[PDB]
Each structure stands twice: as C-alpha cells, then as structure tokens.
C-alpha cells in the first residue's frame, strides 16, 4: 500500500492545525512509528477507522493551482498556501476557476501599471495568477460575446474585497482607454461604509449589505460610467443590537460631532444617551476617532455633489430616528397605552420633523381600520406600539439609504447609452459565532444561494470540458444543496413558520421552536435539535453545522408600519427631504425575512443574467501583521469561503489533467525502449493501462489524460523508488570500482 517507511503524513496538533511527520517503519494492517521535527521519535495511535492524510510530493507543492496537488485535503491546501505566501510572497492563488486572494497587510509593487499591459491578452493559464488575470477573463469574454460579465468577491470585510475591486477597476480603466469613474467610486466608498457598515463581535467595520458596481462600457468598449446597487441590507440592526455590537457607524459619527454648531439644533447627546445606540453597551470602537470619520463622510458627500442642504437633511433625519427611539409608552390597561404628557423625546421628534405633536401622539397609540364605508380608530397594546415605532424607524432608515444610493447613482451615471457592463459584487461570506441569530440566519441563507449558483456554474463548465475531450460526461458527479435551500425557504420552511408565528396570536419563540421540532425534527436529515436545550436548532449548511438561538427571532422578524404614521410624516412641511424619502402598500405588511428573501431573489435574478467569475479573500492573521500566517485563522476563513468544500467536490472527480507529451517526458524514466513507439499517445495509453490496474481510476481524453486523486502521486512515488534503487546500484558500483582500484594501488 502507499504507506511505507520514508513517507510523510499529516498529524493533528492543537497548536498548529496540522503537523508534518515521517513514517519510520512501513505500515502493515494498529500503531505507527512516527518521526517528527518535535523530537526525533513518537508513537501515534490509529483510531477505530482512520489513516492520516498522506503528503503530496514536492514537485506539486507550491504550484500556482491547488488542483495541481495530487492529494487534495485541508493539510495540503493549508501548507501550499502558507508556502506560497510566506516563502515566495505570492498572495494570489487558483482553485478550479476561483481565484483565492490572501491579503498581505504590507503594500506590494505588483499592482503597478506595466503589469496591466503584461497580463493583457494573455489567456488565463498562460500567466501566473493575479487579479488582472480575472479582470481580463471578464473583459475578454465581454468583448468576445454579447454577455455581460460579473466578478463576485467574498470574505470577512477586513480581508480586502474593496482593494480587489479597486484594482480590477484600474485594470478596466487602463485597458479601456480613459474618465473619473474610479475616483468617484472610491470617493463614494466612505459614504457607503458610514451608512452601511457596522461593528460586530468578531470584527470592527463589518459591512452588512451586498454592494454591486456596474461598470458601463460603450459599444467601442470605452468606459462610459458606472451604476451602483445595494442588496440584502439588514434593517433589524437599526432597532436592536446584541452585546458588544454597534448599529451603523453613522449614528455614532453623528453623536460624536454633537458639539458642532450646525448640529446644535439636533440637541444630540452622548452616544449612549439614546435607546438605539446604547443597547450594545459598546459605544467607542478601540482605535478610531469617530469625528474624523464624520469629517471624511461629509467631504465625500461634497465630492459627490450632495449639497450641504441635503447633508443637513440626512443628519436631521438621523437625529430624528435617534430621538424617536427614546419615545416611551405607558400602558393604561393591558390592551391600551398612551404617551405621557409633554413627553420630551416626542416633542423634540415633532420639532425636528415638523409634524404636529398631537397627530404623532394620537397615531402612535392607535391604528385605523377602514372598510370602504366606515373607519374605526382602535387602541393597541404597549407592545404593539413599540413594534410599530421600531418598524417606522427601520422604514425611515431603509428609505434614507435608498435615497443616498439614488444620489450616488446620479453622480456616477453618464449620459451615453450603456452597451454592456461588467459588475463587481462585494458581499459578505459565511458567518458563525458562539451566538447565532436572525442576522446570521439570513446571511447563511444568502450564502447558500450564492454557493448553489457557483456549484451549478462549475458543473456546467466541467461538463463542457468533458464533452470537448471526448470523455463520457455522465461520469461527472454533481453536488446539490437544494435540500437545504428547500429546508430554509420552501413552504413550511423555517422562514415561513417564523412568518406564520409572527401573525399567529400569542406567538412566542418557544411555540415557534416547538413548531420547528414538529415540522422537521426527523423528517429532514439537515435539521437537528441540540439535545440539552429546547430554545435552539441546528442547520447543516454547506460549510458547517450552526446552532441558531430562537430568543431573538420573533422580536426581530416583525415589521408592520401603520399607514397613518407614514401619512403624518409625509405631510410635514418644514423641510424638503422628509417628504422626498417616502415618495413612490401591501409591502408595509411584509416581515423582514420576506423582504430579505425578495431582495435575495432580485440579486439572484441579476447574477443569473450574467456569467460569473469568483474571488475569495482570506485574512491571514488576526492582528494585521504584515505577513504572519496563522493556520487556525486561515483554516476558519477557508471553510467560511467554501474553498475546502469546493476542493472536496473536485477531489471526487478527475481533478488532475496531463498533456500526453508532458506525461511522456516525465515518465520516460519509467518507460522502456520497447514501449516507446511511433505514436506517443498510443504509447502512453499502453504504459498507463499497464501501470494503473483499475481503468476506473483514469480516462483518456483526446489530448489529455485524466486521473483521480492520488494517481499522479502514485506514479511519482514509483518513479522515485525506481530512480532511487537504480541510483543506489550505480553509486555502489562506482564506489566499489574506485576503492578496488585503490586496493590494487596498495598492492602496487
């Protein structure tokens, strides 16, 4: 078998996720005598059943493409990335069609202009990997064929998705022949960060929305202009945060500037004075001056042609939302509530907005039913009043965000008709915490959908390559996460029961969880209950199992916005912007989970129109050190980017492909002169068919041999054995012949 003395294996180690070992005695069917670097010798148990991951030979190690490796597993990937990053400083790497980008914190020269002209024209394999090579593969496919092209970037927001997009756009600008898309888009970045980024337990300045830039090309492939869109914004953060989190930066940047004279009208307090900002208990981010980021946000608005009148509108509305948060209801009786007399937050909210105090005070505590012929003003419980107030705050914020994006688009557009576009998606990756909640559940459902699209695209490209190479295409195995998507989104799924429990009377997180267990507990292999608790459930995702706690879900999922409260706000006359937000029913009833599922279906409609190209970003160390690679963090990021599962899916197939001449060159050491023949293709077909017994392992394509995982390592090992033994025989013969001559010399 493949286990021999003088062979290498990976062993699990809690300090560094895998450790290298050498085998001291050949295996034969319950313990191995394992060498190490950490001392000479060790005795290592096998487990009831398992053998360690066997290590690839060092011709394949450090290749530019992870699927050149003959064994494919987490240790080989982690090692190969670590050696490329640490030893050669090659941050870019390939995996199938994906480009893995490992973020150095140090700056590099490699982005410099000339390299743009060096990569341009070159087919994707003909050059070592770099972000320009994907930017070209898009630009070339756009020029060659009708279709638009898309580039999709995933990873924790520190990883540098924005830097990858920025350089892709520089590539486009420099090849296309420009003006001032790039400078404007990067000027927009601080605004979209300020209103869309957030601070999460694992990460400061996380981005809670998916942001899409459509770079527009003329029919001459001149850059016209750009168009921006945003998807999957999480509204729930606005009203509610977990411990050690903040809601969107802009509220803190606004409160930090309370001293400034133009803000004085807002009567802003300390950032933990209000109810929406205080709940996380974490007002100050370590190592940031918020007032400086405020000044940079304002200057970016000015640079995008939002006049100071509109900027004071934006901050006026945000201060309105903050003051609205403090409004506090007293219950008269269990089904009725009222606002106390001359309540200071409501008075300030009405002053800031212009709406007359009596109308807000009346509508916040009642709702209106109307048939066509009659209309009833009905009191509502303090809980329903609070839910309505929070839904109104979420609705104001979501419309303010959509408005600021409409103005950014107004700056980015240009008049010439767009012939085709190339579109660069910055999104968040798969996400898991000690505590997982409705936000993580929506993020994971979005990532399940994106991963489904990726898997289908890879499967299509590989079917086309197999039909091209005359292999039976029925062999290739397709792996489908549709059963999970159906678990989350189909009727009587998790989201659909959550929406039912919202409306059903006396709903709760306990009765929701009980409905989950009744509906799924043993009917679906992917749904599981944690044994020791009844308030949680487990979904087996693409990457990993994830416990989700129920305690947040129903409080966060509820939106309903009472039409009269909007009709009050829309009526206000004090300033232009607040009527301008709400300008153009059933949508008001929709829950946040349903608005999210609709936004994700819009995103999937936008991507399905287009041929994708992928980038993954991984964050190599937790502390921004320039080149330190932490194998624990990189393992977690490689799982969260689905690279390891992609590699698993690939390792099932034929991952490794060789051209007949390059094979013939390498294995001429194995080949015998009688086997050499006037047709090298037939020669290799014969030699290989002898060398590897089971034809299931390999296929003969028109121009390439295909191998299952390990077979190239098998050939390389038999080559190293044969070449070693032949070298031993020749060496011992030469040593004997010379020393025998020295024997004869001593005789003489």
């Amino acid at each position: 078998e493949l286990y021999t003395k003088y062979a290498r294996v990976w062993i699990p180690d809690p300090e560094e996720v895998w450790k290298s070992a050498e085998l001291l005695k050949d295996y034969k069917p319950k313990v191995l005598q394992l060498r190490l670097e950490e001392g000479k010798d060790l005795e290592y148990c096998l487990d009831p059943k398992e053998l360690p991951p066997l290590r690839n030979p060092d011709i394949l190690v450090g290749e530019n493409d992870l699927t050149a490796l003959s064994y494919l597993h987490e240790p080989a990937v982690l090692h190969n990335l670590k050696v490329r990053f640490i030893d050669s400083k090659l941050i870019y790497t390939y995996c199938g069609i994906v480009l893995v980008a490992i973020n150095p914190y140090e700056q590099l020269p490699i982005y410099g202009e000339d390299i743009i002209n060096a990569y341009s024209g070159q087919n994707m394999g003909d050059m070592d990997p770099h972000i320009f090579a994907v930017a070209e593969e898009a630009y070339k496919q756009m020029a060659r064929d009708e279709r638009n092209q898309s580039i999709i970037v995933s990873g924790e927001s520190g990883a540098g998705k924005t830097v990858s997009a920025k350089y892709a756009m520089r590539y486009f600008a420099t090849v296309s022949g420009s003006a001032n898309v790039e400078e404007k888009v990067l000027a927009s970045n601080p605004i979209m960060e300020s209103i869309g980024n957030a601070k999460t337990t694992r990460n400061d300045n996380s981005s809670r929305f998916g942001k899409y830039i459509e770079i527009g090309f003329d029919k001459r492939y001149r850059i016209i202009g750009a168009n921006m869109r945003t998807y999957l914004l999480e509204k729930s953060r606005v009203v509610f945060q977990a411990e050690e989190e903040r809601n969107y930066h802009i509220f803190y940047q606004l409160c930090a500037s309370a001293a400034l004279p133009e803000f004085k009208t807002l009567r802003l307090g300390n950032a933990n004075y209000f109810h929406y900002t205080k709940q996380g208990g974490s007002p100050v981010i370590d190592g940031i001056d918020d007032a400086k980021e405020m000044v940079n946000t304002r200057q970016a608005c000015t640079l995008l042609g939002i006049s100071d009148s509109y900027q004071m509108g934006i901050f006026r509305i945000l201060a309105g939302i903050l003051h609205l948060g403090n409004v506090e209801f007293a219950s008269r009786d269990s089904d009725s509530c009222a606002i106390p007399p001359k309540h200071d937050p409501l008075t300030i909210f009405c002053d800031l907005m212009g709406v007359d105090y009596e109308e807000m005070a009346h509508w916040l505590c009642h709702r209106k039913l109307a048939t066509a012929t009659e209309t009833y003003i009905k009191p509502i419980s303090k809980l329903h009043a609070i839910n309505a107030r929070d839904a109104l705050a979420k609705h104001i914020y979501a419309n303010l965000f959509n408005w600021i994006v409409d103005h950014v688009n107004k700056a980015l557009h240009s008049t010439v008709k767009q012939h085709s576009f190339i579109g660069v998606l910055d999104i968040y990756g798969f996400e898991t915490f000690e505590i997982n909640s409705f936000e993580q559940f929506c993020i994971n459902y979005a990532n399940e959908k994106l991963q489904q699209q990726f898997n289908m695209h890879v499967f299509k490209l590989e079917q086309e390559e197999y039909m091209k190479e005359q292999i039976p295409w029925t062999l290739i195995d397709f792996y489908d996460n549709q059963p999970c998507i159906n678990l989350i989104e189909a009727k009587m799924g998790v989201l659909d029961l959550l929406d039912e429990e919202c409306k059903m009377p006396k709903g709760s997180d306990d009765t929701w969880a009980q409905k989950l267990y009744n509906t799924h507990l043993n009917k679906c292999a992917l749904f599981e209950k944690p044994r020791l608790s009844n308030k949680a459930f487990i979904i087996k995702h693409f990457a990993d199992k994830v416990e989700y706690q129920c305690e947040g879900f129903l409080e966060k999922n509820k939106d309903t916005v009472y039409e009269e409260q909007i009709k009050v706000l829309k009526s206000s006359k004090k300033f232009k912007l607040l009527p301008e937000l709400f300008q153009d029913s059933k949508e008001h009833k929709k829950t946040v989970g349903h608005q999210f599922r609709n936004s994700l279906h819009l995103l999937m409609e936008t991507l399905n129109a287009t041929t994708p190209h992928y980038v993954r970003c991984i964050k190599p160390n937790d502390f921004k050190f320039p080149f330190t690679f932490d194998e624990k963090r990189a393992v977690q990021q490689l799982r969260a980017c689905g690279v390891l599962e992609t590699i698993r899916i690939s390792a099932a197939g034929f991952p490794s492909r060789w051209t007949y001449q390059e094979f013939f060159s390498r294995y001429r050491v194995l080949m015998k002169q009688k086997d050499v023949l006037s047709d090298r293709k037939q020669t290799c077909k014969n030699v290989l068919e002898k060398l590897i017994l089971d034809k299931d392992k390999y296929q003969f394509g028109k121009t390439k041999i295909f191998f299952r995982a390990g077979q190239v390592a098998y050939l390389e090992k038999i080559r190293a054995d044969k070449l070693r033994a032949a070298c031993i025989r020749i060496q011992k013969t030469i040593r004997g012949w010379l020393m025998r001559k020295k024997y004869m010399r001593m005789r003489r």
């Binding site: 039913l369 109307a370 048939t371 066509a372 012929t373 009377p505 006396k506 009833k589």
Partner: protein
C-alpha cells in the same frame, strides 16, 4: 394564490381576500322579487335582485332572507347570493382560489354537506373549509383563551375555549337575534 374568505349570515354578507385588513364586499343578504305588474315596455324587467339592488328598489319588492337562524332555508337564493358575491361584487373567478366559509356551531350537518357540494360542483372551487364563528373571533381579538359571546342576526352562541381547545359540552346556543329584536 390568495384564498377567498367569505362569511355568511342572516343579515350582512362579508367577503374579501385572505390577508386583507378588512372585507372588500359587504352587503345585506337579501333576494328580492317584484310584486307589481310592470307597465312600461322595454323597461328591462329582471327576474330578481340581490344585495344592494334589492335594498334600493325595495319599495317595489318582496324581500326574502335565505338564511334564518344560521340555517340556509332555500338553496336557490343562497346560490344566487354566492353567484353575486364571486362574479359581480368581488369580480374574481372561484376556479382560481380556495374558499373559506363560516357557520354557527351546533348547526345541522346537511347545511355543511350542501354548502360544500355547491362549492365543488357549482363553482368548481379548488379547495374549501368551514370555520366556526366563535373560534375566528379569538383569532381576530388576538387570544388563545376566553369565552366568546357572539350574536348577530339569527343565532346567538357562547363558545368557551382554553389554550386552543374547545369544550363542546359547554357550548351554548340561543335564537335571540337582531331579527327577533327587530320584530
């Protein structure tokens, strides 16, 4: 597809789409026939009127209520009122939408049998259900426990419910009514 929700009674008919905040069609449930000799020629004399039409003309008409005491007591007029409800007043074909129908408890079984038979055969409704009025009042008022007292035209009935279980032995029914208050 949004199911229809239809609530019949003596007195008003209330119908609308599920998920709406309030009923889309409300009209008194009457079928009326003329009782005078039509003198003008080309008037467009009509065999009978339903709902608001029968109310406006009513001085000319005999008005007959096809439901007394929550029981449908002539099926032709009731089927006319459903015809008017789906085609004229909601303007939506029943072959698209499930339908939900409402009845007072402790009614005869034949009333449910005939009402379902007419829904499947005569309107071809793809699916239907029949709910109890008192149970639905608890959904509307936002509770899973209470004793409902519900009194319309025709039947008055109490139904106690405790955490989503009815208590059939405690159900009470009475025939005091808006109608007997009128008489």
């Amino acid at each position: 597809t949004t199911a229809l929700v239809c609530d019949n009674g003596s007195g008003l008919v209330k119908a609308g789409f599920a998920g709406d905040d309030a009923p889309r069609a409300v009209f008194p449930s009457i079928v009326g026939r003329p009782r005078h000799q039509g003198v003008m020629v080309g008037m467009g004399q009509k065999d009978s009127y339903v709902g608001d039409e029968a109310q406006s003309k009513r001085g000319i008409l005999t008005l007959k209520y096809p439901i007394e005491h929550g029981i449908i007591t002539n099926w032709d007029d009731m089927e006319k009122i459903w015809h008017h409800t789906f085609y004229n007043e909601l303007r939506v074909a029943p072959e698209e939408h499930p339908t939900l129908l409402t009845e007072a408890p402790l009614n005869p079984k034949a009333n449910r049998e005939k009402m379902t038979q007419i829904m499947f055969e005569t309107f071809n409704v793809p699916a239907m259900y029949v709910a109890i009025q008192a149970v639905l009042s608890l959904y509307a008022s936002g509770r899973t426990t209470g004793i409902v007292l519900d009194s319309g035209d025709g039947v008055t009935h109490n139904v106690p419910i405790y955490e989503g279980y009815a208590l059939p032995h405690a159900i009470m029914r009475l025939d005091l009514a808006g109608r007997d208050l009128t008489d």
